[PDB]
Amino acid sequence: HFRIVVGLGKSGMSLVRYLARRGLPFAVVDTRENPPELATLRAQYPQVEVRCGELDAEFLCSARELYVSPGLSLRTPALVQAAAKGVRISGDIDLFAREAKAPIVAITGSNAKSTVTTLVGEMAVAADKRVAVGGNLGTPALDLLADDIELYVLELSSFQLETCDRLNAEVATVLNVSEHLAKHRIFRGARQVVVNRADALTRPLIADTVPCWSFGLNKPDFKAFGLIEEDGQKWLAFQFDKLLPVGELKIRGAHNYSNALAALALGHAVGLPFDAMLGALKAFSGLAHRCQWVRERQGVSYYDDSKATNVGAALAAIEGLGADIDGKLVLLAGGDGKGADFHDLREPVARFCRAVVLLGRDAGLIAQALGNAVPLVRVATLDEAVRQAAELAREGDAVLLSPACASLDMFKNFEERGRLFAKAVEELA
Ligand SMILES: Nc1ncnc2c1ncn2[C@@H]1O[C@H](COP(=O)(O)OP(=O)(O)O)[C@@H](O)[C@H]1O
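A: This is the predicted complex of the input protein with adenosine-5'-diphosphate.
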């Protein structure tokens, strides 16, 4: 107990692995009497001291560092007592930041984190880098640590950044902010930043004193990635250099063009050559249920954006795909809204939608927020939502599942909702 892992779960087990494989002395504690991972720990690491129940503050103060699971309150009185006593309140990313021996690309934001992370990951692979990609919900960062790595690409949550004293990223970004200081801990020690010209809350104080690259959907200036319009066609661009027509991407929607430009900026900051980045961009087809094409039927396209589980995400996808088609959107939305203010959807819906089909627990709340902006239809099931959306759509339109809500009121998770949407779409005559 020179070091104590505080809290089991995904990251805690990666700390157990890391500390043990490095031979370091450590113990494990958890507040629950029978945490789910207790059996796995007791079986895979029988030699590790494990204490379950009310945290022994005296035991926690016998360590120099506590590695606190991200989704565990730092307000726990024993942690407060340990923190009041001088113990380092740490975590997996804090330890990773101090152990890493290669530059880190560090990505957070309210939305688009996994899209941009995986794209930078594919750029790095295409550039022949010995790259390691992880963080947040993916591969635990500590499982990536090795001397042969040339580049780390880390997606980070605010919770992981809370106990990280100085990440010292080579380049860091907050992609966007929607309902910020926790996110901005990603900039502590950052040697470069990438900012979103469309979101003022992404610009850190250090953007005045370290290299600052930007992305956005308007025409870029120096040190900026953006869109150039020429010959009626839109191009991804760096400064005055057209890179690629957006039509050669396999991902759709202006929000995904923004994600591509963010990834280009991140890869550029760490020296990835443009030919490698552009090759990966042409090959990148996006992640499952991130505005994914399902079908083209009678001139109408169908897109599964089931992972738009919050209002900021749906707004971006509505505006994004709405600006990327020949017609109007027929939007499918609703589900468990988690108390969100849906008013921000009214203007994008009025601007881009022919109609909205609403289902799920909070369809009524969404209807209240949308008012009479566009024609609304209420349905009971996803199958009926798709059938009605197809009848409402006209040639050139896109039918978009971008629900702005969690799915747990009717589905196991957003993946199941997306799959059942695609199934219904594929069963249309
Ligand atoms: N540039 C963007 N800004 C805001 N929302 C976006 C953007 N790109 C994608 N989204 C929305 O966020 C959803 C989740 O994208 P994802 O890349 O999985 O984000 P995260 O990993 O941060 O949860 C997408 O399905 C889409 O609805």
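Residues 3-94 form a domain with the Rossmann fold fold (CATH 3.40.50.720). The first helix runs from residue 10 to 21.
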